[PDB]
Each structure stands twice: as structure tokens, then as C-alpha cells.
């Protein structure tokens, strides 16, 4: 026992070397000679009403079109954002809904919460109503996040410390990742849908291949929970949001933090983020009931989006870029473009 | 517009009125939050998520049971009932560190909690047998005494109402170490036998209300 | 889904009768209606229509004030009171259902008929009445309207319909680009303002009768002369 410690010990102090050599230099002392965004200027183009209690999840469509929001009044509402309609109102068997995923064919969705049960929703069949498709069973802490990568596979990651992949029409774990130390809060598929990046309360963050089942990375530059986590649309790095009241870009190919994200008069965690269409602006959700526009290049407050009276639960874009959504405790969800 | 879209307007139009009446119907309900450990009677107070409803006084109550993030989840909840075994002195620190964490929650700070002391039947007859003394556990007991006028006991031990008003004063000057006023711990007594426990919440609730439209009003 | 229909029979001219569709197969409730006649041997002609929550109606001028259209959602039926029947009134009538939404495909399902006899608008029109086919070719029939159906939205209000001898008319393309389900793919659409094609490839056997194009942007609804296809 103590001489398995020493060795682990020694491969820690092995793999922190390894990669403070690696670190030549650093992405805030190389795109300092760049053109900075300025004033990120936003305004609410649509809000949405009809949720009556907290928002907390919200996921755009493959059409950037039609959304899914989810909210603790315990209904999934499926907005057409154009003409601010409402085109399903799904009640959900569980109000205690904690995140809310669109299917990339457009049939289905999935929301998943403190039941620990991914339900999946049918939502273009005969009959003309949105019909209970599948539920997910398996995971033993209350569900963080959960993405389809197709009509029949969808990836979760729940507060046991576990993210799985499933197969919808069997229903069944097909692999089960392991080795985060707390709950895990946030997961996002890779744009090519093969690995996917997992962030959890022991302030670490790993990769996974979807196929083989293992850890190929485990990243550390957080002093306190992880609470969202997005890929970049380049597939090959990603972001973190804390409750440190920082964000942090990681890369994959190094393998170390690369920026963080913080302001001294920001002390509020971070409760959600996702990416432009470019990735050039890294969008946050705070407990302040506003969200930052963190340029990821160079990790500066280049805007707010500053319309919500309760805190910001839910942040997404749109698969064109031409829209931001964002969803808060105000009951209140928001186009911003 | 079309008359595909001023169908498809039309459908929108009812979809609200239908979530207009959800959340009519839904609006009337009080939350809850129940906390504890183990060992505890934490689920034997009344009779994923153990969601349980029950009504006192044309008054409905959904207790939540969850099974410390997530904590969120319950931010704007009437009280949290944070159920603690006065039984056994071992864990009763253990406890006592829950209660210190749950009260000074930054996302409870206006959440008043109502603490229930569980199995003090099991507490007197320990009292009683003599073999663990509190004292043992917590040193300053053995330099405690029961207050002399606030002792209201139906014929009980002073013994068993000393140890239970030691352990009682521990819990509330912890809640009281900073509370500024924006919340109020709730401290009662339970048997597993005592039916008068959704009472108890019920006057609690109420306070707190009265508390909060009192603040609002700046009368207290 | 069904949409059995009853009524009809003979009638004395000035009298009155009421035609019911009886729905069972989806949610009724949050399903338009429409009535759909078509004359002993004319193509078809829109009569009605009763909007979800009846809370929006249209008739037709040709029978507005003599006809009522009313539904019971919770008996799942649809109801078409007559008044002052004409000559011309003699028919095989229809119902069909419309769902209203983004994305989706109205006129999905159309039902079998009852027959009735007794002893501006929008125009499009199709060119041909017959076009004799051989099987395995592909057929393209073009149908042109009045005015252009492209909508600010960027929607082409243009629907297809194929009635086959002894059957109801089904619907084959939506919004005159968007195939519907149950069809073989081998049938398509597209077109440009108030030029509109649809093309059948691979022509098999079954795929016999008369084909008819609809538009949606404004009520009335119109329906054109029809367009037969012979072996």
C-alpha cells in the first residue's frame, strides 16, 4: 500500500514536470498583439414568457429555431424564437429538471435532473402530441447534464461522480465513465460527436473517447467546484466555470489550463458558458443575475448581457451564430443578438 | 401573417392560457426542504426525490427529501426541517458541524431552519442508566446548569432536562453566532411518537412569514 | 388515425341534412377541420373550415350563410349543418385534418367520403387532364397559380394530392417542397414564383389516378381541374 502511494506520488510529480515544460510560453503573452472585440452590445430581441418559476436549462435546436427550455415549474416548453411562439408545452413527470438537450434530428428531446432518470420525448409523430420515448434509468446521483450524439445515443453525467453513454432503443449503458472524485456538473459532446469533456466538484476536469471507455486527460486548475463546462467549436480545447467566480480555458493537446477568466468585483460563481460560433467569445452566466462576454482569446470583459433580475441558470447559442439564449431564476428566457 | 401563422399564433395563445392555469393551481403550495443524517428519523417525521405532500389548516406542504450542492435547487423554499439524533453523543458533534455548514449556507442565509432534536426518549433513559455522560464528550456540560425560571417539564428528570437544554444551547448559539436577524432557528423536540410535528412546522411557517412582511414593513 | 364520415343520401331540393366526421386515432382537440366535396365527376372543392379551440371559422362564399361547421372535442367530432340545398350541391363530401405549427404538415390525412345528391379567390389551374404514362418513366406535372405563394416567412403555400379510382385523396408534398409520411420517396417538388413542378420517378404501378394541387396562403381554398394519369 505505502509503496503503491510512493509510485503514484512519483507519477503525479512525473506528469506536473512533464507538463511545466511543455508550457513555453502563454496564450495571454501571445495574443496580446491582437485586434480586442471592444463593447459587446447585446440587446433582448425576444423574451419569452410563460415559464413561472426558475429557469434552469435551455437548448437550442439544430435549426436555431426551435429551443427547448426546461424550469423548475416542471414543464419543457419548446419555443419557436421567430415568431416568439410556443409551438409544444411538455409536462415533465419531475419539476426538479436541472438540465434539457434537442435532439440533432429534431424528434426528440431529453431532460434530466435531481430523479436521476434522462427522459427522452418523441416529438414529431402521428397523433399530434409529444409522447414519452424512453427513460434512462442507471446513474445513481441526481442527473448534471445530457446530450445526444444521435437518435439512439445520448451521453450523461450525473453527481455520482459518473458520466455514461446509452443506447435509447435498447435503453441500456453502453460504456460508464469513472474517475472524477465529486459530482459532475457539466459535460459537452465533441463537434465530430467521438470525445467529450466532463468538469465536477474536485475542481478537475477529464476527457473521455466515447468509444473505448477510458480517461485519455484529467486537468486541475480550479480551487473549488466545477459547475459548467463547453467544448470549443474547434473540438480540440474547452471551458470551465467555477465557483471560484473565474472561468478557465484548457486545451487537449497540451494538457494544462491555458487562461482564466476572473474580475475582483466578480465573487459570484459561475453557473453556466458556452461558446460564439467562432468561439471567440466565451459567454458566462453568473449569480449577479447578469452574464459576461469573456473574449477566450484574451479573457476580457468585452460585454454584458444585463437584463435578468434573478441569477443566470442557462447560456446558449444558436448552430448559426446569429442569436444568443440566455435563461435565469427570473422565470424569464431571452434572445439576445 | 398566414393563415398557417395566425393558426400556429392562435395554438401559442392557448398554450399559454393552459400554463396561466397550471401555475394558478400551483401557486398556492408551500416547499420545504428536509435535512438530516442517518440514524436519525430523518424520513419518519410525518405520516431520486422522496416528495411527500401533506395539508394542515387548508394549508399544503411538499416536503423534499433529496438523496453539498444542490443545495440551489432549494433557495427559495418556506424552511428547511433539519432533523439531528440527540440519542448518541458520539456523532452528536458531527451533527452539530451539519447544523454549523447548513446555517451558514450562503444560499440559506434567509432560510430559517427548523431543528428538530430526535429520540430524546433514548437520551433520558441514557441519562438515566448513567454509562455515557455527556460530559465526556463535550467538557463544558460538567460546568452547565439548567436555567431556573425557563425549565417548563411535565415531571421529568432534572438530569435528563439539563443535558437536553446543554445540548439545546449548543445548537442555538451556534445558530445565533451570526444570524443578523434575517433568519431565526426553530428548535423543538421529538419522540418518533410526537404527532404534534406538522403543528409545529405549520406555527414555524408562519412566523416566518409574519418575520419576512414584518422586515418588509420595517416593524422588526 | 380515422376519419369515418356519414350522412349523405337523397334528398329533396330545399331541404337540409347534417354530415358528421367521427375521428379516432390523434388528438382531435388539437386538429383543425375542413370539409372537402367533390362533384359526381368535377375535381374537389373546399367548404369549410373550423380552427382548434373553435375559436377562428371560414366558409365558403359559394355556400357561406346556408352551411355551419362545429366540432365536439370532447366527442371527438366534427359537424356540417346544410341549409337550402342547391342543384349544385350534390357531391361525395370529405373531412380532413390540419394541424398548425412550425413545421408542420397540414392536410396529413384525409378520409372517405359520403355522397349527397338532390333531385376574388386565388387561381390555379392544371393545363393537362390527361397525360397517358408507360411504367418506369418519370412523369413531371406542373401546376401555376395566380399570384405568387411565397409568404414573407419563406413559405410556398402549395400542396399535392393524389386520388386514386375508388380511394380518398391522399397528400403526397407539403408547402411544396416537403415530402409527408407514408410516401415513397420516389415522389418530389420544387419549383419557383407561381411556377410549380412535381416530379415522379421510377413510376410504378399503384401510383394511378388524378392529381390535384392545392394552395394555403389565403381562404378560400382553391383546387385545380385535376390531372389524370392513364397507363
Known amino acids: 500500500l505505502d509503496q503503491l502511494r510512493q509510485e503514484a506520488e512519483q507519477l503525479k510529480n512525473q506528469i506536473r514536470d512533464a507538463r511545466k515544460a511543455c508550457a513555453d510560453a502563454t496564450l495571454s503573452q501571445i495574443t496580446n498583439n491582437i485586434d480586442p472585440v471592444g463593447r459587446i452590445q447585446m440587446r433582448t430581441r425576444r423574451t419569452l414568457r410563460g415559464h413561472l418559476a426558475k429557469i434552469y436549462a435551455m437548448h437550442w435546436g439544430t435549426d436555431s429555431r426551435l429551443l427547448v427550455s426546461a424550469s423548475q415549474d416542471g414543464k419543457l416548453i419548446i419555443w419557436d424564437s421567430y415568431t416568439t411562439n410556443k409551438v409544444h408545452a411538455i409536462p415533465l413527470r419531475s419539476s426538479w429538471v436541472m438540465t434539457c438537450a434537442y435532439a440533432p434530428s429534431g424528434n426528440y428531446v431529453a431532460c434530466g435532473g435531481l430523479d436521476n432518470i434522462c427522459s427522452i420525448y418523441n416529438l414529431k409523430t402521428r397523433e399530434g402530441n409529444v409522447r414519452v420515448s424512453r427513460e434512462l434509468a442507471g446513474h445513481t446521483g441526481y442527473l448534471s447534464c445530457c446530450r445526444f450524439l444521435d437518435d439512439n445515443q445520448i451521453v450523461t453525467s450525473s453527481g455520482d461522480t459518473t458520466c455514461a453513454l446509452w443506447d435509447i432503443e435498447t435503453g441500456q449503458q453502453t460504456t460508464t465513465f469513472t474517475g472524477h472524485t465529486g459530482d459532475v456538473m457539466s459535460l459537452s459532446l465533441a463537434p465530430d460527436t467521438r470525445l467529450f469533456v466532463s468538469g465536477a466538484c474536485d475542481a478537475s476536469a477529464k476527457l473521455w473517447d466515447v468509444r473505448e471507455g477510458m480517461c485519455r486527460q484529467t486537468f486541475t486548475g480550479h480551487e473549488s467546484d466545477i459547475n459548467a463546462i463547453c467544448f470549443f467549436p474547434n473540438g480540440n480545447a474547452f471551458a470551465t466555470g467555477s465557483d471560484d467566480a473565474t472561468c478557465r480555458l484548457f486545451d487537449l493537446r497540451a494538457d494544462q489550463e491555458l487562461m482564466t477568466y476572473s474580475h475582483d468585483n466578480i465573487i459570484c460563481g459561475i453557473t453556466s458558458v458556452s461558446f460564439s460560433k467562432s468561439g471567440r467569445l466565451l459567454l458566462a452566466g453568473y449569480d449577479d443575475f447578469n452574464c459576461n462576454v469573456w473574449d477566450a482569446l484574451k479573457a476580457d470583459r468585452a460585454g454584458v448581457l444585463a437584463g435578468h433580475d434573478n441569477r443566470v441558470s442557462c447560456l446558449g447559442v444558436t448552430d448559426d451564430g446569429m442569436a444568443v439564449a440566455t435563461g435565469s431564476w427570473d422565470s424569464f428566457l431571452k434572445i439576445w443578438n | 401573417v398566414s393563415a398557417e401563422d395566425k393558426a400556429a399564433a392562435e395554438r401559442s395563445k392557448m398554450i399559454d392560457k393552459n400554463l396561466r392555469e397550471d401555475g394558478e393551481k400551483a401557486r398556492r403550495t408551500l416547499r420545504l426542504l428536509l435535512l438530516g443524517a442517518d440514524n436519525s428519523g430523518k424520513s419518519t417525521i410525518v405520516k431520486g426525490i422522496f416528495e411527500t405532500k401533506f395539508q394542515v389548516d387548508k394549508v399544503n406542504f411538499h416536503m423534499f427529501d433529496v438523496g453539498r450542492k444542490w443545495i440551489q435547487c432549494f433557495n427559495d423554499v418556506t424552511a428547511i426541517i433539519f432533523v439531528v439524533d440527540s440519542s448518541d453523543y458520539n456523532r452528536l458533534q458531527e451533527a452539530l458541524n451539519d447544523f454549523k455548514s447548513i446555517w451558514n449556507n450562503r444560499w440559506l442565509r434567509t432560510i430559517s431552519v427548523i431543528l428538530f432534536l430526535n429520540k430524546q426518549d433514548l437520551l433520558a433513559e441514557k441519562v438515566l442508566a448513567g454509562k455515557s455522560k455527556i460530559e465526556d464528550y463535550f467538557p463544558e456540560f460538567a460546568r452547565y446548569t439548567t436555567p431556573e425560571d425557563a425549565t417548563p417539564e411535565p415531571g421529568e428528570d432534572p438530569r435528563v432536562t439539563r443535558a437536553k437544554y446543554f445540548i439545546r444551547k449548543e445548537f442555538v448559539d451556534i445558530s445565533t453566532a451570526s444570524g443578523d436577524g434575517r433568519h431565526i432557528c426553530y428548535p423543538h423536540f421529538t419522540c418518533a411518537v410526537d404527532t404534534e410535528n406538522a403543528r409545529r412546522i405549520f406555527n414555524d411557517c408562519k412566523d416566518i412569514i409574519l418575520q419576512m412582511n414584518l422586515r418588509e414593513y420595517n416593524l422588526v | 388515425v380515422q376519419l369515418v364520415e356519414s350522412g349523405g343520401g337523397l334528398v329533396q331540393p330545399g331541404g337540409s341534412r347534417k354530415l358528421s366526421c367521427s375521428a379516432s386515432?390523434?388528438?382531435?382537440?388539437?386538429?383543425?377541420m375542413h370539409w372537402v366535396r367533390q362533384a359526381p365527376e368535377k375535381g374537389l372543392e373546399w367548404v369549410a373550415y373550423?380552427?382548434?379551440?373553435?375559436?377562428?371559422?371560414y366558409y365558403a362564399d359559394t355556400v357561406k350563410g346556408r352551411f355551419t361547421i362545429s366540432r365536439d372535442d370532447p366527442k371527438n367530432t366534427l359537424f356540417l349543418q346544410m341549409t337550402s340545398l342547391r342543384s349544385e350541391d350534390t357531391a361525395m363530401y370529405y373531412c380532413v385534418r390540419s394541424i398548425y405549427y412550425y413545421g408542420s404538415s397540414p392536410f396529413d390525412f384525409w378520409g372517405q367520403g359520403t355522397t349527397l345528391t338532390v333531385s376574388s379567390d386565388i387561381v390555379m389551374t392544371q393545363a393537362t387532364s390527361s397525360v397517358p404514362v408507360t411504367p418506369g418513366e418519370s412523369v413531371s406535372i406542373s401546376c401555376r397559380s395566380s399570384?405568387?405563394?411565397?409568404?414573407?416567412?419563406?413559405?410556398?403555400?402549395l400542396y399535392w394530392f393524389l386520388q386514386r379510382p375508388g380511394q380518398s385523396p391522399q397528400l403526397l408534398i407539403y408547402?411544396?417542397?416537403n415530402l409527408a409520411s407514408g410516401v415513397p420517396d420516389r415522389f418530389s417538388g420544387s419549383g419557383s414564383g407561381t411556377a410549380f413542378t412535381l416530379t415522379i420517378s421510377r413510376l410504378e404501378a399503384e401510383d394511378v389516378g388524378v392529381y390535384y394541387c392545392?394552395?394555403?396562403?389565403?381562404?378560400?381554398?382553391?383546387f385545380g381541374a385535376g390531372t389524370k394519369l392513364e397507363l
Open positions: 399570384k405568387s405563394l411565397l409568404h414573407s416567412n419563406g413559405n410556398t403555400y
Open positions: 386515432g390523434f388528438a382531435f382537440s388539437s386538429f383543425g
Open positions: 408547402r411544396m417542397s
Open positions: 373550423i380552427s382548434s379551440g373553435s375559436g377562428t371559422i
Open positions: 392545392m394552395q394555403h396562403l389565403e381562404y378560400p381554398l382553391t
